[PDB]
C-alpha cells in the first residue's frame, strides 16, 4: 500500500508569490510560491496518485500585512480552498493570544486542528473542547491513516498562549494517543507537528509506533540530489532515524515561506511497516502556473490591502540581509540598522541588544531602493517597542553566553548588536563560549570599545520582548536594576529611515568567531 | 653679558584667548593664552631684564575666523602693538598666495621678516626685493646680535607659495650668511625658523658659529621639571646639542597656540660664546591678567566676526577630538566625523572608502556649552577652503599612501591618515614602507557591503580632499597614478550640513586604525 505525503511548514502569511528570497514580489516573471501556485501543483499530484494526504506543520500565522489585516481569516479560507487534510498547531498561531486562534481559525478550518501536547484548564477548558484535537484518524481510499500533533514546548517564550494551557514534553503526551491508536487497530501513523528538527529526530526515535515525522520551526531543508535554488541541504530528504525497537523512520521538513511544496512517497506492508520512502520537496517557481480561480480570490482580498499608504519611507542603496540564514548565525546589516536606529531614536546610551527571532524578512534595494510600510511591516511585525534597560556586566555576559548556547539549529536567541563588539569560540562547551566582549564606554568624553567588567553596570537599548525573558532570556527579566518603556518598534525603524533618507548598513566585524 | 629670548611658534590665530586644548574660550575663569595676557607677561620681564629680545618663529597665519575675516592684518596690528623684534617665515604664511603674504604683513610689519633658503626667480625677484631678509644685525643695549631665518624646505606640498618661490636646503643656505655675519663683527648668533624639532638639532649640530637655535612647525614641547599643564616633553628646556665645532648649542620650541611663553636667560662672555642658559615655557593662565589696552583692542576688532551667523549648525554629546597630538598619531573621531560626513554628503547627490590627512584637522570642538556647534567652532577646524574630491585607485597606489601615511612616524608630521570604510593595521618595529601588515576595504561589487583583503591589482573609488588628489602632504603616489578625479562639494558645507542633517552626533573611536 502505497502513501503520498504532501507537506508544507511556516507558510508565515505568505499568501501571495513572493521574490525567492521570499520579501515581497516585484519581478513578477520570477516570483515564486504563493496558495495561488500552491493549488496547482497540489492538483496535478491528486489527479495522478490515489492515496494523497495535504499536511501543514504549522506556523501558517504571522509574517506581512495579510495577518496584520486578516489576523488568521485569510488562513482559514485560503487553506479550506486548498483542502488541507490536517494541521498541527505551531508558536505562531498564539501571537493574538486564545481569542486570536479560536474565532478566526478553529472556528472557520474546515479541517482538524491538532496537538497532543497542549492541555486546557479553568474556564477556558469548556469553551476550547472540540476545537482542536489530540489527533486525527483519517480514511485514505480502503485504509485508514492515525495523524498525531505536537507543538513546541518553547511557545510561552516565544507568543502568547495565557495561563489556561500547559505545554506538556510533546513524547511524553505523544505516548499515550500512540498506544490508543494501536489499540483501535490504526497500524499506520504519521507524527505531525511544531517543535524543530533536533526534536522532531527524538520524536522518531523514542516514541513506540511513530512511522513517519513531519516538522517545521527549524525552516530545515532536506534534498537529495542537487538542489534546485539558494537552500543548502542540511541532510538527505528524508532523514532516517534508526528507532530505540530497532525500525527506520523517516523525517521531513519543507524549508519555509511556502516556496516549496514537500513530497514523501511511503511504501507500507499489510501491517502498516514502512517498506520503503523516497521523494523531495517541489520548488514552487514560475514554471508552475497561478491557478487562475485562487488568483482572481487572492486579488478580491487584496483590494484592503492596497488602501496601504504606497508613500516611500525612505531609499536603500544596499540589500538589507534580515534573512533567518544571516540574522540566526552571524552579523547582518539589517540587524545592525535596526540597532543603530534604536540608538539614534534614544538620543534624540550607546548600547543594544536584538534577538534574530525579532527579524522576520530582508529588503530588497533593486525597486529604486524604495522603502514602504508594507516592506518594513514583514520585518517587524509584532507591534512591540524598545526599552531602556539597567543591566550588570555579569547579566550581560549570561545573554552573550545563552545567544549561543545551542548554536546551528536556526533558534531565535542569537543576537544582533550595536556599540558591542563580541567574539565567540563554538568549540568551547556551551555557557563559556564567549571569547572576548567589548562595549562602548559611557564615562568618557571620547567613546572607545573597553573590555566588559563583571561588576560594572551598563545601560543597554532592547526589546521589550526580551526584557519580558522572551527566547529564554530569563536572566535579563530576574537581574535588570531599571527598565522604562520605550517607542514603538516599527515606528523608531521608519522614522531613522525617513530622517536618513538614504541608507546602506554594512557588517563591519561587530559579531566574530574563532 | 646675559640676553633674555622670549620666544612664540605656531600661533595659528589664536588672538584671543582660549580653552586648554586651545578650542574656543567659554568657561573665562579657566581660559588661556590670548595676545593681551602675552602683553601683561613680556612687559612684566622686559621691565625685570634690560636685554630682552621678543621673537616669533612662524605660523602666526590660519587657525580661526580671525584669519579668513582679517586676512594677516590682525597678525601685523596685533604683533606690532606687542613689539616683537624679528620674525621667521612659516609654511602657513604662504596660504593666501605670494600676494596674501606681501600685501597685509611684509608691507604692514614694524619689525623684520626672515628667511634665509627661500629664493626668488621670474618676475617676482623684482616684486618681493627686500621685503623678506635672510638675516638682521639688532642692537640690545650697548652690543648688537644677529638673527638668520629659515622655513621648511616641504612648504610648496603643504601652502601655496607658488612657481616663482625655490626652497634650498636649511644647513646649506645658512652657513654663508652666519659667515658672513662673523666678518661683519657680529659674534652672538640666533637661527630663528620654521622647519621642525629634527631639523633644529641638525641645524644647531652643523652650522658653524650658531649659538641659540628657536624652532617651530613640529608644536614641540620642552621642560625642566614638573610639567604645569597637560603637554608631555620631548625633553628638558632647553635642550642640548654638542656642535661638530665643539660646543654646546640650546636649542628651544614652545609648544604653540600661544598657550605659553618661551623663556630663556642666556650668559655670554665677551666674545659672544655661551657659558650657560636656563628657563622654561611660562604657561599663560588666569593667574596672568589680560591688559586692558590690549584687550579693548581684541574687543573692537570681534565686533566684525559677531556678524558670522550664531546659529546653531547641530549638536555634540562627545568631545570631538580635532587634536593634532591624537589625529596625527592615531584614530580620532573627530577624522571619523569628517571621512563619515564625506561619504553620506556623496551618497545623498556608491563611493563606500575615505582618506583624511591629519595635517587638514585643525582644532577640536567642546561637548560642555550644551554641545553647540556654530560656523565659528567648524572654521577652526576646517580653515583652507578646499573641495572633497571623487578619485579611482590602483590598490598598489592605496597600499603606498599607507605607506607614506607612517613612513615617518614620531615627527608629529600632517601625512597620518584618518579613515572611513578602511580597517588598517600599522606594525612600526618594521622598516619604513613595509609597515601595513592588514588592510581591509569595504566591497562595493556586493549586495551586503562587508570587509575584504585589499588586492593590489584591483581598482577602488576613493573621497578625499583635493589637495591630497594634488599630491599635498607629500602623496606624490596620488598625483601620478590615480585614474580618475572628479570635483567635489565645498570642504566645511559638507561637514555643517551633514551636522544640521543629524540634529546630535555623537563619533566613536571604532578600531578603524590598529598597531601591532
Ligand atoms: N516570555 C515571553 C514573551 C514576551 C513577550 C511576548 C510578546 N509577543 N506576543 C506574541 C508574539 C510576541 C513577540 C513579540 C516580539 Cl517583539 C518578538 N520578537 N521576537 N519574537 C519571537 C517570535 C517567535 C520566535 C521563535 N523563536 N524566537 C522567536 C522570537 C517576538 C514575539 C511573547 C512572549
Ligand atoms: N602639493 C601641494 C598642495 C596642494 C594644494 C594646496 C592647497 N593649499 N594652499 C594653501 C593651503 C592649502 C591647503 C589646503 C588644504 Cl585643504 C589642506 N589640508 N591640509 N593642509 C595642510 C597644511 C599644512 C600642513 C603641515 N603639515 N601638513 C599640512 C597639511 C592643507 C593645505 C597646497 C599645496
Ligand atoms: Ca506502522
Ligand atoms: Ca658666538
Ligand atoms: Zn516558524
Ligand atoms: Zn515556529
Ligand atoms: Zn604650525
Ligand atoms: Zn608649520
Known sequence: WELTILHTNDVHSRLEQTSEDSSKCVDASRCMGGVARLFTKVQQIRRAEPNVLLLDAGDQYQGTIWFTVYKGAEVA??????????????????????????????????????????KAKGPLASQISGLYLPYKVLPVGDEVVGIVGYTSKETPFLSNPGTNLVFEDEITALQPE???????????????????????????????????????????????????????????????????????????????????????????????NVISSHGNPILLDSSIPEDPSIKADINKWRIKLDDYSTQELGKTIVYLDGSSQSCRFRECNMGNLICDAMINNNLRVSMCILNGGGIRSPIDERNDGTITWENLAAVLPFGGTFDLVQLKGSTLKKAFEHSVHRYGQSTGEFLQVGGIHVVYDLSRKPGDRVVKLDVLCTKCRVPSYDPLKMDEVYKVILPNFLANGGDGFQMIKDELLRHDSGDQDINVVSTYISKMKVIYPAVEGRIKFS
Open 77 to 118: 479560507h485560503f487553506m479550506n480552498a486548498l483542502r488541507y487534510d490536517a494541521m498541527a498547531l505551531g508558536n505562531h498561531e498564539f501571537d493574538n493570544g486564545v481569542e486570536g486562534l479560536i474565532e478566526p481559525l478553529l472556528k472557520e478550518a474546515k479541517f482538524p486542528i491538532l496537538s497532543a501536547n497542549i
Open 178 to 272: 500512540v498506544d490508543k491508536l494501536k489499540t483501535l487497530n490504526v497500524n499506520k501513523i504519521i507524527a505531525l507537528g511544531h517543535s524543530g528538527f533536533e526534536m522532531d529526530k527524538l520524536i522518531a526515535q523514542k516514541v513506540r509506533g511513530v512511522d513517519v515525522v513531519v516538522g517545521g520551526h527549524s525552516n530545515t531543508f532536506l534534498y537529495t540530489g542537487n538542489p534546485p535554488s539558494k537552500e543548502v541541504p542540511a541532510g538527505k530528504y528524508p532523514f532516517i532515524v534508526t528507532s530505540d525497537d530497532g525500525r527506520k523512520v523517516p523525517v521531513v521538513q519543507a524549508y519555509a515561506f511556502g516556496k516549496y511544496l514537500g513530497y514523501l512517497k511511503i511504501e507500507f506492508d499489510e501491517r502498516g
